[PDB]
């Protein structure tokens, strides 16, 4: 799949497609690096296949917490802001690395390009191709067409995310519905 994305990027430029990924082609590595950068930038916001709610307790007597997973963003369920310094948990506002009690937080992990949904992968590949074309051959009609294709795949990814995450009116209607029962 990654080879297909790199081939899409090369097709956008008009160069020759590759059949062996991790080759010595100068533009092959460029496509992979651009794809990785775009993927990390776009998965930073929470999606249905990135956000996991976990709670980690300091294993020793109250001290540091080594953050697991390949985290991209790290929100705190409690009223504290969390960071990631030297691979361990860090309190951004308190400027401390040692925690006393267990912390509950929602972490946005990173997903490899081989194991993400089809629509999201297509969006990432086409955005990378559009960015590479803009940087290489300049901004023209081809750039706008590639941006349009990327936007269509973005709409498809948004539709998938909204379908798999049921976002209905179930926040305050619970109070007005449990009372009728």
């Amino acid at each position: 799949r990654l080879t297909d994305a790199v081939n899409v990027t090369l097709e956008a430029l008009g160069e020759s497609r590759i059949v062996d990924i991790n080759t010595s082609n100068p533009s092959a590595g460029l496509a992979r690096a651009a794809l990785d950068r775009t993927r990390r930038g776009v998965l930073s916001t929470g999606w249905w296949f990135n956000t996991i709610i976990r709670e980690v307790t300091p294993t020793p007597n109250p001290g540091q917490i080594k953050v697991p997973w390949n985290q991209l963003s790290m929100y705190g369920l409690d009223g504290t802001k969390y960071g990631e310094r030297d691979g361990v948990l860090y309190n951004l506002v308190d400027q401390t690395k040692v925690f006393s009690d267990t912390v509950h937080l929602k972490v946005v992990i990173d997903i490899d390009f081989e194991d993400l949904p089809e629509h999201m992968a297509m969006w990432v590949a086409n955005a990378t191709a559009a960015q590479v074309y803009l940087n290489d051959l300049g901004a023209d009609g081809n750039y706008k067409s590639l941006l349009g294709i990327a936007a269509e795949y973005e709409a498809m990814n948004m539709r998938e995310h909204l379908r798999n995450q049921r976002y209905s009116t179930s926040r305050t209607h619970a109070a007005r519905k449990i009372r009728s029962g």
């Binding site: 497609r17 059949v19 062996d20 990924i21 991790n22 691979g87």
Partner: protein
């Protein structure tokens, strides 16, 4: 031929088709690839015992051919190397992690068994003689 066992720089002498195919083990603990970087094709530098295990993926073909694509002689060699390496880790015994049938090893004894603790584990006679 497919695994290597041996404080900041680690050499990689075994061949591979991709960098991500190599898993690094420290004291039988796996380390995520985000905790180290590849200085070269034969050097791994950690961020801060050493066992390297190769595991080529078997879900996709490494080299996919396409109609109207550039072809070189080395493509067939790499494609064959994929299966060759897969058979290599199959032979070394570090790939198979269990069985789903009854082994029928005919009149041969298994050696170097660790003493089980869960009563469902197998047992060697180093404990049978002690019991006896």
């Amino acid at each position: 031929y497919s695994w290597s066992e041996q404080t900041t720089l680690i050499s990689v002498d075994i061949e591979y088709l991709d960098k991500s195919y190599i898993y690094l083990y420290i004291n039988n603990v796996l380390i995520s690839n985000s905790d180290y970087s590849w200085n070269s094709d034969t050097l791994i530098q950690l961020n801060t015992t050493v066992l390297l295990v190769r595991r080529t993926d078997k879900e996709y073909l490494y080299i996919m051919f396409a109609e109207g694509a550039a072809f070189i002689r080395e493509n067939l060699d790499v494609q064959n190397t994929q299966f060759l390496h897969l058979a290599q880790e199959l032979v070394e015994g570090r790939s198979i992690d269990g069985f789903y049938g009854d082994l029928s090893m005919n009149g041969y004894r298994i050696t170097h068994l660790a003493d089980g603790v869960d009563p469902k584990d197998a047992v060697n006679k180093g404990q049978l003689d002690s019991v006896s």
